[PDB]
Swiss-Prot record, chain C:
Leader peptide range in chain numbering: none
Protein name: Nucleophosmin
Post-translational modification: Phosphorylated.
Site description Interaction between pentamers, residues in chain: D43, K68
Protein task: Acts as a chaperonin for the core histones H3, H2B and H4. Associated with nucleolar ribonucleoprotein structures and bind single-stranded nucleic acids. It may function in the assembly and/or transport of ribosome. May stimulate endonuclease activity on apurinic/apyrimidinic (AP) double-stranded DNA. May inhibit endonuclease activity on AP single-stranded RNA.
Portion of the full sequence shown: 16 to 122 of 299
Quaternary data: Decamer formed by two pentameric rings associated in a head-to-head fashion.
Subcellular location as annotated: Cytoplasm; Nucleus, Nucleoplasm; Nucleus, Nucleolus
Domain of life: Eukaryota
Family (UniProt): Belongs to the nucleoplasmin family.
This protein's encoding gene: npm1
Curated annotation (Swiss-Prot), chain E:
Post-translational modification (record): Phosphorylated.
Top-rank taxon, per record: Eukaryota
Description of how the protein assembles with itself and partners: Decamer formed by two pentameric rings associated in a head-to-head fashion.
Annotated GO CC locations: centrosome; cytoplasm; nucleolus; nucleoplasm; ribonucleoprotein complex
The protein, known as: Nucleophosmin
Site (Interaction between pentamers): D42, K67
UniProt GO MF annotations: chromatin binding; histone binding; identical protein binding; RNA binding
Entry function: Acts as a chaperonin for the core histones H3, H2B and H4. Associated with nucleolar ribonucleoprotein structures and bind single-stranded nucleic acids. It may function in the assembly and/or transport of ribosome. May stimulate endonuclease activity on apurinic/apyrimidinic (AP) double-stranded DNA. May inhibit endonuclease activity on AP single-stranded RNA.
Family from the record: Belongs to the nucleoplasmin family.
Annotated localization: Cytoplasm; Nucleus, Nucleoplasm; Nucleus, Nucleolus
A GO BP entry: chromatin remodeling
Coiled-coil residues: none
Amino acid sequence: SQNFLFGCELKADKKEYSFKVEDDEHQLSLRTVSLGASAKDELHVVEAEGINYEGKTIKIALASLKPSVQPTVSLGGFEITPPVILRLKSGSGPVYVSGQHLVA
Amino acid sequence: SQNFLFGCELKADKKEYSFKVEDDENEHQLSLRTVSLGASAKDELHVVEAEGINYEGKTIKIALASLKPSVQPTVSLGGFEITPPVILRLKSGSGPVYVSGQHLVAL
Amino acid sequence: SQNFLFGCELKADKKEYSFKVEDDENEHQLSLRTVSLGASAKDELHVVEAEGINYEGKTIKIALASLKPSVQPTVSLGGFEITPPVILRLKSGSGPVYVSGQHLVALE
Amino acid sequence: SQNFLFGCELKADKKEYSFKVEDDENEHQLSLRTVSLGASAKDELHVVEAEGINYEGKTIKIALASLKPSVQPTVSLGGFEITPPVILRLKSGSGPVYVSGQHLVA
Amino acid sequence: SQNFLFGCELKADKKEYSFVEDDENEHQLSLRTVSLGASAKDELHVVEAEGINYEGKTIKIALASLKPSVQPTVSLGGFEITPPVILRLKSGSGPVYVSGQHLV
């Protein structure tokens, strides 16, 4: 309903970003995943970790990106319910993630 | 309507994922968000298909994406919604290929 | 609404796919999601178009996507909603070219 | 709500497409889905622009897409909704360039 | 609601575009594409957006990385942002264009 900016940066020496919220309805809406200019020229895979419909945590790949092929990927508003961790699975980074934090 | 994370991995010795739901209180849809190749995938075509019914009850196979590490390692589908049951199948390539989405649940 | 899979394959020997549904009291809609190149597509530009009626009632042709195996083998359309009748046509390129999406049927 | 096909072709000899509607009862919206290069387009950057009024009433030009046949021959907009009137224009490149979407009438 | 065109141009010169109106109405920018103009140099450009998170802290988020020879346009799919927001060309020459909707 209300909407605010969200972002994070993943790199080899900080690979994880933990999205959680203190109880007060929230979604994280992912929009883009992009590589910074100094990312190495190799495939970077970013993954999300969160609850499936049977209440178990799963790890899913969100994007695979390479500077010389495909530096940005737009997700078009992929909504996830917190808690979620974003994780860098390969490549040096930096990788950036943008989106919205939604609050209803 | 509620929303839960969905993913599966397809590869050489595991080419299919069967998305099925039991009858519970709810209407279910699988919303596909991305298809992505993993970093160990061979530099060749990968084709990912969906298998489910058309509007006349016939089972059809439809091509979701053609991907290749050096050209286009990821495609974002934008929320391709599919009523269960559906099989997602690595029709061609070694993989690994990851498919991510949401499992949407509504009364 | 009900939601079903839609696909077609457009090729040299079958350039057109005609999307038409039997008379019924339901409203029908195609939501195009992807277009993609088959394995055996020549490395060249392939263009898929749609042919159907515009607001004025006139039959028009519109270019949906241009793809090439070594540049961009898949194009997501993100839910390009079209009201049947429509013909999808390989306008150039050898193919094969696949088109995927959803076929939506709502109640009256 | 009614949904019709929309498209236009922009090229060296026809650089502009002017979209306008006259309707005192129903609202119209042009929902742009893709921009794509034709098969004979020169392998160079192509820019496609729209021209239309902003919130303050000033007519403005915005860039919709930059495409190039050997790099990114199609750009998907996702349903970029525009209130008529609007001009679509090929700012630079040979073309031909195609714009496709939906004409929606409520 | 009402729906108007929006756009701006970002360049090494004027790196910034600034998007409240004092108004009785709610305003949203929906960002559609980010694209590199004809004379932009063949290098990595990064566009960022600056605005509050849901805690009202000012944050900066990477919207897109683009390069003429690899991905000259990124489509964001309607990334709705509530004003004030600054859009800025964190790196590269430009010109970089942003296009979208101003909804009221």
